[PDB]
Short mmCIF file of all heavy atoms in Angstrom, two decimals:
data_model
loop_
_atom_site.label_atom_id
_atom_site.label_comp_id
_atom_site.label_asym_id
_atom_site.label_seq_id
_atom_site.Cartn_x
_atom_site.Cartn_y
_atom_site.Cartn_z
N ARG A 58 -91.49 -40.56 -80.62
CA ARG A 58 -90.33 -40.16 -79.84
C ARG A 58 -90.61 -38.78 -79.27
O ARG A 58 -90.46 -37.77 -79.95
CB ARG A 58 -89.07 -40.11 -80.71
CG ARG A 58 -87.86 -39.49 -80.03
CD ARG A 58 -86.58 -39.64 -80.86
NE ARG A 58 -85.45 -39.02 -80.18
CZ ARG A 58 -84.95 -37.82 -80.47
NH1 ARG A 58 -85.39 -37.11 -81.51
NH2 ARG A 58 -84.04 -37.27 -79.66
N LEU A 84 -91.36 -34.54 -87.55
CA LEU A 84 -90.24 -33.96 -86.81
C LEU A 84 -90.52 -32.48 -86.53
O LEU A 84 -90.74 -31.70 -87.46
CB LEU A 84 -88.95 -34.10 -87.63
CG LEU A 84 -88.50 -35.50 -88.05
CD1 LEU A 84 -87.26 -35.39 -88.94
CD2 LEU A 84 -88.20 -36.35 -86.84
N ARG A 131 -85.93 -43.20 -90.15
CA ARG A 131 -85.51 -41.83 -90.31
C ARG A 131 -85.08 -41.27 -88.97
O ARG A 131 -84.13 -40.49 -88.90
CB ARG A 131 -86.66 -40.98 -90.87
CG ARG A 131 -87.25 -41.48 -92.19
CD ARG A 131 -88.18 -40.45 -92.80
NE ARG A 131 -88.93 -41.03 -93.92
CZ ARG A 131 -89.99 -40.47 -94.50
NH1 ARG A 131 -90.41 -39.28 -94.13
NH2 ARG A 131 -90.61 -41.10 -95.50
N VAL A 132 -85.84 -41.59 -87.94
CA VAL A 132 -85.43 -41.39 -86.56
C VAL A 132 -84.46 -42.48 -86.14
O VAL A 132 -84.77 -43.66 -86.25
CB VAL A 132 -86.68 -41.36 -85.63
CG1 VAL A 132 -86.28 -41.32 -84.17
CG2 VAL A 132 -87.58 -40.18 -86.00
N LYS A 133 -83.27 -42.07 -85.69
CA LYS A 133 -82.15 -42.97 -85.49
C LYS A 133 -82.05 -43.46 -84.04
O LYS A 133 -81.49 -44.52 -83.76
CB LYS A 133 -80.84 -42.26 -85.87
CG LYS A 133 -80.85 -41.56 -87.22
CD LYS A 133 -80.73 -42.58 -88.32
CE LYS A 133 -80.78 -42.04 -89.75
NZ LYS A 133 -80.94 -43.17 -90.71
N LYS A 134 -82.62 -42.68 -83.12
CA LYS A 134 -82.57 -43.00 -81.71
C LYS A 134 -83.71 -43.93 -81.34
O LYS A 134 -84.72 -43.53 -80.76
CB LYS A 134 -82.58 -41.73 -80.85
CG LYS A 134 -81.32 -40.90 -81.02
CD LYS A 134 -81.50 -39.51 -80.41
CE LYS A 134 -80.18 -38.75 -80.44
NZ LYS A 134 -80.34 -37.32 -80.04
N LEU A 135 -83.56 -45.19 -81.76
CA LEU A 135 -84.63 -46.17 -81.61
C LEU A 135 -85.02 -46.37 -80.14
O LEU A 135 -86.20 -46.54 -79.81
CB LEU A 135 -84.23 -47.51 -82.20
CG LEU A 135 -83.88 -47.63 -83.69
CD1 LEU A 135 -83.56 -49.06 -84.06
CD2 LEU A 135 -85.00 -47.06 -84.53
N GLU A 137 -85.40 -44.25 -78.00
CA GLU A 137 -86.23 -43.12 -77.52
C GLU A 137 -87.62 -43.12 -78.15
O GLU A 137 -88.45 -42.29 -77.80
CB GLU A 137 -85.53 -41.80 -77.80
CG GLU A 137 -84.25 -41.69 -77.00
CD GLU A 137 -83.54 -40.38 -77.18
OE1 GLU A 137 -84.10 -39.47 -77.83
OE2 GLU A 137 -82.45 -40.24 -76.56
CL1 CL B 8 -82.85 -39.36 -84.15
#
Side-chain angles (χ1 to χ4, degrees):
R58 170 172 180 260
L84 302 176
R131 304 191 190 167
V132 173
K133 311 284 177 192
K134 292 168 174 172
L135 300 181
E137 295 182 8

